[PDB]
């Protein structure tokens, strides 16, 4: 297994300013951070159709730093620029601003609590955060597992997750954030040349990749869930171990198209629930196997 | 009422090596597929996958759509098509003669499958001739985990149970299958006729309401029979059904579809324990139904 932690550029409903808070984690098994810093219960990481294809539309032609030789997240923010902007990816004046921003605090849940919550955010010209224009809403996730403040059976089930992630396993980290001033959703995914431990991550686990999604506020995709998706797909072995072998984007685009390849698609069925989820048993078991080959 | 669907595929029958069509799959809610032997297997739930949903997309957004054709007969709404398709530049002027007859060719069943031996995967060529297509063939999941059962052991005919399902008052769906290597993309067209009219080339003679003509060249990404599978699964979705006998225009297909898609819950490849599936596969499969079901005046059926 593997310890992946999702972040966003937020604005703390307190004093208003622009921070990165943590969104959901990953052990194999996702969790979600409820609005009161609480975690939600593990479950299995379900995605969009929309954000398999999105995520599918910007890693390939993704911005790929493989074996970059630097440990810290200010050496990773300015490298990943460096290649943005030469890429096209970004305009040489956004670097600033958007090198400004990544390098914020990095909160965590307990802090959540403190700073009373956080909103939702877009990075503007200025470096000043603003609303996002487009109508916001909480996730399916935190409607439907961000419903305790305490786990039902056990007020601290969630943090058993934790005690999951093995003894020398390495982490990721996926950014997300929003800035008005972009042109287009881009991604990035850097893998260091040596596994670094980073101060943006909840635990000391040595950060191994990274994965960073920026892009404009713009009506057809949702960010906190190609980053659930971009995170998903890290904590999948055989995609992860691709992750770890691949020298080129095509590589790891190769392995991202078994991914898509393998996954089992459940339209909207009335049958009922447990029968019509217990269905997917042979069929996954059967693409399970393919994945492997 | 719950559409039977019937999905059919441009074929080569083993022995003879002509060309025809041969019945794949059937819809009535649960799929069922036709084993090579002629039998049918297990009635399941539709799981679709990514690819053949997003190929579905991209056709049904450049789609040609013919509502409230008043046509009765499959030559009749296949002339039509055809003039469609080519207006709208689908298909060259050139490509209509060989399509015409084509989707003219004998529409057979599982009982014929039987008595021909078996069918083979076949491609159209310019002249009309089958063709052996060029990517290596397949069996498909579902060909696999689902249709050995064919051979009458502690349930005789239990997959002809789903039979007992159709409606007293229901209308059919006939999905039309085909690789032609000689287009130059792969095309949709969906057809609704002003009046249900009873086809021979359906296995019962429930009145044909819609078709789904889905041709194209063998292309990456593109399973003919997958492509197929998700067009039937559409139309076997109640919302959708209520969607496409209430549309006048594309654009209502294809908001449907849209839902159809938000709706779709993806699950990633990952080592299966039935515990660790219901988590997510109860809660997220009910807020996924009931979104689904939101804005429509259906009703969920158990």
Not at 31 to 46: K, Q, V
Not at 255 to 269: A, Q
Request: aromatic share 6%.
């Amino acid at each position: 297994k593997v310890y992946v932690e999702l972040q966003e550029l937020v604005m703390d409903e307190k004093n208003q300013e622009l921070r990165w808070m943590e969104a959901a984690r990953w052990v194999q098994l996702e969790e979600n951070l409820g609005e009161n810093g609480a975690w939600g219960r593990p479950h299995l990481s379900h995605l969009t159709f929309w954000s398999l294809l999105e995520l599918r539309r910007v890693f390939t032609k993704g911005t790929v730093l493989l074996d970059l030789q630097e440990t810290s997240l200010a050496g990773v923010a300015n490298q990943l620029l460096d290649r943005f902007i030469f890429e096209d990816q970004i305009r040489p004046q956004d670097r600033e601003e958007l090198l400004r921003a990544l390098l914020l605090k990095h909160s965590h849940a307990g802090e959540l609590e403190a700073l009373g919550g956080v909103k939702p955010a877009v990075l503007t010209r200025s470096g000043d955060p603003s609303q996002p224009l487009l109508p916001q809403h909480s996730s399916l996730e935190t409607q439907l597992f961000c419903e305790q403040g305490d786990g039902g059976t056990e007020g601290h089930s969630p943090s058993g997750i934790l005690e999951k992630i093995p003894p020398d396993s390495e982490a990721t980290l996926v950014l997300v954030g929003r800035a008005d001033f972009l042109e287009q959703p881009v991604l990035g995914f850097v893998r260091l040349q040596e596994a670094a431990e980073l101060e943006a991550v909840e635990l000391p686990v040595p950060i191994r990749f990274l994965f960073v999604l920026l892009g404009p506020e713009a009506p057809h995709i949702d960010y906190t869930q190609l980053g659930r998706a971009a995170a998903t797909l890290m904590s999948e072995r055989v995609f992860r171990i691709d992750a770890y072998m691949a020298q080129s984007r095509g590589e790891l685009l190769h392995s991202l198209e078994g991914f898509l390849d393998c996954s089992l698609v459940l339209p909207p069925t009335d049958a009922p629930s447990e029968q019509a989820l217990l269905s997917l048993v042979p069929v996954q078991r059967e693409l399970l196997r393919r994945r492997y080959q």
